[PDB]
Amino acid sequence: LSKQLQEISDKLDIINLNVLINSTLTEITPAYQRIKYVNEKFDELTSTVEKNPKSYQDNVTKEVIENLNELTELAKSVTKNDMDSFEFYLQTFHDVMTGN
Amino acid sequence: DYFNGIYGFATGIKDIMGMIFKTDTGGSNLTLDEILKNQNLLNDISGKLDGINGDLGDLIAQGNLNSELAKELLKISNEQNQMLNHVNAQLNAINSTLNIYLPKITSMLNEVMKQNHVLSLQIEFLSKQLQEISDKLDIINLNVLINSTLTEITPAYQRIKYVNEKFDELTSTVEKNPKSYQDNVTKEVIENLNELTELAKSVTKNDMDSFEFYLQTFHDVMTGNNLFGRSALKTASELITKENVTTRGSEIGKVYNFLIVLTSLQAKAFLTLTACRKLLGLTDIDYTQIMNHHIDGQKREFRINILPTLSNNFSNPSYSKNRGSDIDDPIVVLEAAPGYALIGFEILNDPLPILKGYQARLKPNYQVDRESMSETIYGDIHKLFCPKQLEQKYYIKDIEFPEGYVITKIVFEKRLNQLGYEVTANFYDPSTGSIDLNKVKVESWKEKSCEEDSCEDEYSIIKAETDGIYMPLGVVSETFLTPIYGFGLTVDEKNQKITLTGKSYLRESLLETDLLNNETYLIASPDGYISSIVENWNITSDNTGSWRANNNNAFVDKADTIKGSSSLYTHKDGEFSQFIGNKLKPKTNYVIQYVIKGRPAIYLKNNKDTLFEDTKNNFSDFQTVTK
Amino acid sequence: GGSNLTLDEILKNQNLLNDISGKLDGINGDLGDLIAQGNLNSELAKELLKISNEQNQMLNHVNAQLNAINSTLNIYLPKITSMLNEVMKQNHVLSLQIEF
Amino acid sequence: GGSNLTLDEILKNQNLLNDISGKLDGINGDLGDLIAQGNLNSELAKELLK
């Protein structure tokens, strides 16, 4: 049902009341972009899953610097989930979708 | 020269990355916090305090002293040692940096600057070309879908371009290792230090909740994966295919040029990001995979759901009213060499109405050779295109040969104001680039009545008005020179304007090479001329070749007035000489053009006659003139 | 009090660092007093003095960190908590003025 | 000028230099009054004097 949305995308050349769909999109699309971006950081999580079999076996005190690296990408991404930020974007997105 | 296409450009940026990715950092934690201007000052403190502390510590180590006095002196020793230790720690950090790191980093950065400049020369042309396209496009009757992509893309684009610009220029204006920013005197450590600090501040600001968000979403909007999947590529296609945009090149040319601009932007940004990372400390990230994946995604988009919808039809960009003739039967032939092929046209009038025709050999998959190119200039083309107070018969056809053939000779016929022509094509092989010379096809008549019945009818006519007929004006070619298989004339006498038109192989010329990631070889449309009787007329290499200056006030000087380009400089006696007599055939017209700043003294002299001389105009900023 | 409430302070080792500080203080005091006794082999004195310097440096930076943490958790957090608790109630009161 | 060699970290170096001056003065005071106690061999005083 994600793809079917494109079957509307191609044929939604709609006019004559575009002020509303200018206002709403200009207001919503940043949060949407950001949420999708955060999500794709979990395709790179899957990349770390692919990494996993390369170090799942040598967890005998070697991980202390091996697997403290090899995931620093996530260790960063997560730190970008605080501090007057992404939480905010999720919240305001919900607020608009509900219409508050 | 050549433009090696988006795939080659990506390979170049990837090689630059692979270069910078490896060299070194030693960790070295380039945090700007280091005062870095007291490498001299702290050294004095370190030395003096070291001497004092050593003296006092040795006095203690002598032993044999009053016990409480020993405790007091030991506490003094501890305090002094603490102060000195933290001071020399700061100094040691600074000096370790200014000896181990700045040489390494400066070297790598200087290396990255040159190859960046080289790759920028690969799109300098299309930069200004897209600028011009932006100048002549109007968005009237736009849909909400357009405003959609505009608001979805504009901030990311703004910031990506800004960063690319800023970093790329700062790569240059940062003093290199000659100074090594050393303690040498000062004010090198004000200015070079300010610039280094600014580089540091910029690269630092590239690791947060931004700019790996901006890049990604930019790529997404391009591919068309936003909240309702409208690729900005498609909306740009729609905007461009809207008319009133009549400039050089067809639809495919313009949209592909747009995608070139954007893909070059993205690759440059990836390079900048990796450079920032290496310039900071550790955790290199091999972005090449993501960059290639994104580029291939955008190219797949462009290939699948835009390209098959566009036309290779291309028209003259402008028109011009001109008074021609009727009592003449002008005949014009534009016949490429037997191993050549027509690759576009151009109409100029400033010296006089002139049609110019380019020709060249072919490389496989409809690729043109840079050399073997040739420009040919023809005379009073208006007299073929324009009447004088009498009607003009114009037979109008969309002549096109089958695929694999290439238009190889276009002969014009105007007989008592009846303007027809002759289009002859030869066979060509895309796999080998070879053009056959024994399988041709001809077209003698220029209408649809002859197209369906081989009967003479269905021309169009123009009633000669007073001031002149709007004749074609400008360039007749795709943005990239390309053998054409379609040609025609489509005059619209309703407003008394004529228009040429052809169909280009550009689609197949690239679909086999670029969008399949192979060695592409295109050539941007030459804005001006390409050859000259004057050998090395384009003096830039600080070498004169056949040019000669018989005075030291006449010198070559790549930076004559600026390093941007050379322009033979002469002051108060300067004379640049070149024997040219052997090549000018007698009793033949010649057009002259040159870009001159100041007031030079120009002469075409055989020591007896000066066939031309201009010594009057004063030009502050390199005005070009043609006579 | 200025008190520079920078979060950097580990602030969960106020116990752990104290053990290190105490033990190293005892050791350094013993060795320094042994030196201050004087009347000892000169080069041996130089060696022990260098050991003293190294230990004193380590201990000094450690107890500096501890002193920052403890100065905070004694001088600042009471003050700040009091002021914050005070600001909470009056905020709530004023919010009752526009709840409707 | 002055910051011709600085970057309005005149203040940063200024405070650093001030702290260093304070610590050095505090050390010098203890050294001086320990001298004032005196009552030592000449060299074991003269070296401290130096």
From TrEMBL, chain C:
<protein>
    <submittedName>
        <fullName>Vegetative insecticidal protein</fullName>
    </submittedName>
</protein>
From TrEMBL, chain D:
<protein>
    <submittedName>
        <fullName>Vegetative insecticidal protein</fullName>
    </submittedName>
</protein>
